[PDB]
Amino acid sequence: TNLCPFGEVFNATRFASVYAWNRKRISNCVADYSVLYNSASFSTFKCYGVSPTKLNDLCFTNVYADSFVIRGDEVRQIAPGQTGKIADYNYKLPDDFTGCVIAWNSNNLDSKVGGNYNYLYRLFRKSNLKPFERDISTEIYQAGSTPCNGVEGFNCYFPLQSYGFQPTNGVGYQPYRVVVLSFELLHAPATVCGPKKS
């Protein structure tokens, strides 16, 4: 049973904050993908540079599974060519993305009555992230012309701000768990294959 651990990426109890998005490399296994078959349990399901109906007969050098939590109106940014706080400062997909984006409403897991504040995102950054870059630093962001000396205040901001996931928010402000599969093809033997060309 060298079966690729895709289901464990989807059914994990804990998901990372988007600024520190988790990456699991999937290698040296037979790809299941059966979790993708139930489109009804997802709020968005889209692949890019590949059709989902071809995954079972394809081979790849590596599969990366990226996962994190964002709010509802921000899921549209997990796509090639998008902009916004998530796509600029937290998680950027390349224009030539090859993979799938999966998300579902996780209000029943990640929202608490007093509000869940454990999920963070980056509000500010001197420049956009390059595709698949991760930024977990917490230097004070200088928003104005006057430099900060590591001290917060006006125009001197802590760069990570917290979501407020309350079960009674509107769906655009409810938490969404996102999984991003990227399929990597190098000039090297494939280690992850669909069950129809194992």
Epitope: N38, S39, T44, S51, T53, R76
Partner: antibody, heavy 120, light 110 residues
Framework: EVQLVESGGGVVQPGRSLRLSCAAS????????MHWVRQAPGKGLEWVAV????????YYADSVKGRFTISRDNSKNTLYLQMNSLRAEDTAVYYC??????????????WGQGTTVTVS | NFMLTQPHSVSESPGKTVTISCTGS????????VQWYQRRPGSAPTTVIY?????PSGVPDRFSASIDSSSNSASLTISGLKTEDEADYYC?????????FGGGTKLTVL
């Protein structure tokens, strides 16, 4: 040659029950999801239900939620739609369709030629 | 629930191009894959577009589709109109546990 031939009832009394059958040929039936879609005379297309290749996932349109019941038998290559408590607004040509690609069923691929169910 | 709304009718002259719109409501059209189905008078439906803008083998390149998240709409476009294109056109997708069809647009080739 992927073929879907629905067979089943025509004229039935309101409040009765009827069993639709869909015979699939020309593809590995067990590895595809299947949809039921109807088209009442004059009206447009309307989805009834869908069943996964396993039978483990079943979903229904709200307007048929309790009465209708989808099922399949992969040994007989047959899709079934059990509709009890038939009402008159369910009068339509009933199409049976397979999902695009194996397993996935977010889309329909080949459609059948339908059976016309008249409730009166 | 998530809804797909098409115009009731549309019509153009042979050789011209027409465009059928499919605008979602109570949900985003760009979230999930959008399909286009063609049902000729009396016939069974056939598939013409899948996964937003793909053509199955056999569908002429006169058929094209796209998404517009600004307007929350999908758009089928048929070029070089021919009388064989006269049909009802239904867009389709799904929101969670519900698969949705647009009301359907009858296309008349003048």
């Amino acid at each position: 040659e992927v073929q879907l031939v629905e067979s089943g009832g025509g004229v039935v009394q309101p409040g009765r029950s009827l069993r639709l059958s869909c015979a699939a040929s020309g593809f590995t039936f067990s590895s595809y999801g299947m949809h039921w879609v109807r088209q009442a005379p004059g009206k447009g297309l309307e989805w009834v239900a869908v069943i996964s290749y396993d039978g483990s996932n079943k979903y229904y349109a709200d307007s048929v939620k309790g009465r209708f019941t989808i099922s399949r038998d992969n040994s007989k290559n047959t899709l079934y739609l059990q509709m009890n408590s038939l009402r008159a607004e369910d009068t339509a040509v009933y199409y049976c369709a397979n999902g695009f690609g194996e397993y996935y069923y977010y889309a329909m691929d080949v459609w059948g030629q339908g059976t016309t169910v008249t409730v009166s | 629930n998530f809804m797909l709304t098409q115009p009731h009718s549309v019509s153009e002259s042979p050789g011209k191009t027409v465009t059928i719109s499919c605008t979602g409501s109570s949900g985003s059209i760009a979230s999930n894959y959008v399909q286009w189905y063609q049902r000729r008078p009396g016939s069974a439906p056939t598939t013409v577009i899948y996964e937003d803008n793909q053509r199955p083998s056999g569908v002429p390149d006169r058929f094209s589709a796209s998404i517009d998240s600004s307007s929350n709409s999908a758009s089928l476009t048929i070029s070089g109109l021919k009388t064989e294109d006269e049909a009802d056109y239904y867009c389709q997708s799904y929101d969670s546990s519900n698969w949705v069809f647009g009301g359907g647009t009858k296309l008349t080739v003048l």
